[PDB]
Design a binder for this molecule. Structure first.
Ligand code: OXL
Ligand code: CL
Ligand code: MN
Ligand code: MN
Ligand code: MN
Ligand code: MN
Ligand code: MN
Ligand code: MN
Ligand code: MN
Ligand code: NA
Length: 327
DNA sequence: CGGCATACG
DNA sequence: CGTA
DNA sequence: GCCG
């Protein structure tokens, strides 16, 4: 009925089990904060299964046979069905550890391992970090300086304005180069916390060296509040606002046209969808997938793809448009 | 039991 | 280590 | 935590 991999089923952005999936994703996030990547994956996959269902789960019976639902995740759902609340989920939500790790890892430049060390050192608030600035990287300094703006949702109106600015710099850097919106906005999201663009050129090889030229041109237009210094740039952009501006996270990626379908697939997401697609590729088809290509390790050859549709066909999967990849 | 995606900065 |  |  329900296939076991997220890449085998459509998952829309909005669905019929929002509250249940949100609770399982709390437990997934908490597992990640404790270094338990296996438990994180199971809770993420269980949440995703619910997102793919055609109607609301009303009774425990309806979980029988669903993949990734065992004793633990089924108990979470049963408590939510019976009481409207899962005691374990609420305990996590309320915990100082969860709240502080969430706060710290949401900083650009701070991962789980840094947040955990800071937690163990007794630090709890952003102002605690600002009081010891010499212990921060340039990237963390930027993430902390801009943290408030970076916590404010990006709207689709913002995205269209940013895309025009990036296109202008890309056109000067290399006439004929193209700019494609990726990430969650390509999956149909109306808001996000960052904007992603994928840049290529129709003539293989002409894109070499492009990203430095693009960044220099954005920087001299005064639009770059932060960048590293390549084929991936993780920036903070200055975005105009009524009578002011706000900081926005923007990722710029370059790929040659031979790699573009793979890069588009990977950068469009969702994260879980791509992990599941790569898992499926390797475990079920014996092929190795990343955002550069698809490798047959037995013949030692790369698959040529001209489209995302090609890639799904290579893997024997029915095609899913981006708006159904919201695993 | 082992596995859990796979890259770049 | 961080980032996607 | 769950799957094969
Ligand atoms: O930023 C994200 O979450 C994405 O683009 O999928
Ligand atoms: Cl684990
Ligand atoms: Mn348990
Ligand atoms: Mn009860
Ligand atoms: Mn994104
Ligand atoms: Mn991004
Ligand atoms: Mn590359
Ligand atoms: Mn084991
Ligand atoms: Mn375990
Ligand atoms: Na972070």
């Amino acid at each position: 009925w329900m296939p076991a991999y997220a890449c085998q089923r459509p998952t829309p952005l909005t669905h019929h089990n929002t509250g249940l999936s949100e609770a399982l994703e709390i437990l997934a996030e908490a597992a990640g904060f404790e270094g338990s990547e296996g438990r994180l994956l199971t809770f993420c996959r269980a949440a995703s299964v619910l997102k793919a269902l055609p109607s609301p789960v009303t009774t425990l019976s309806q979980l029988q046979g669903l993949p990734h639902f065992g004793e633990h995740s089924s108990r979470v759902v049963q408590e939510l069905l019976e009481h409207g609340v899962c005691e374990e989920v609420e305990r996590v939500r309320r915990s100082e550890r969860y709240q502080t790790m969430k706060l710290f890892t949401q900083i650009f430049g701070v991962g789980v391992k840094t947040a955990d060390r800071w937690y163990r050192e007794g630090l709890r608030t952003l102002d605690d970090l600002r009081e010891q600035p010499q212990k921060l990287t340039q990237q963390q300094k930027a993430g902390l300086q801009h943290h408030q703006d970076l916590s404010t949702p990006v709207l689709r109106s913002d995205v269209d304005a940013l895309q025009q600015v990036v296109e202008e710099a890309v056109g000067q850097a290399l006439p004929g180069a193209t700019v494609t919106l990726t990430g969650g906005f390509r999956r149909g999201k109306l808001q996000g916390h960052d904007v992603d663009f994928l840049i290529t050129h129709p003539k293989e090889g002409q894109e070499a060296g492009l990203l430095p030229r693009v960044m220099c041109r954005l920087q001299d237009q005064g639009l770059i509040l932060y960048h590293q210094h390549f084929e991936r740039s993780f920036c903070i952009f200055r975005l105009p606002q009524p009578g002011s501006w706000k900081a926005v996270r923007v990722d710029l990626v370059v790929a040659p046209v031979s790699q573009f379908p793979f890069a588009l697939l990977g950068w469009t997401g969702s994260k879980l969808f791509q992990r599941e697609l790569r898992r499926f590729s390797r475990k079920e088809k014996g092929l190795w997938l990343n955002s550069h290509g698809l490798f047959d390790p037995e013949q030692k050859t790369f698959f040529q793809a001209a489209s995302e549709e090609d890639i799904f066909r290579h893997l024997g999967l029915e095609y899913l448009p981006p708006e159904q990849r919201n695993a």
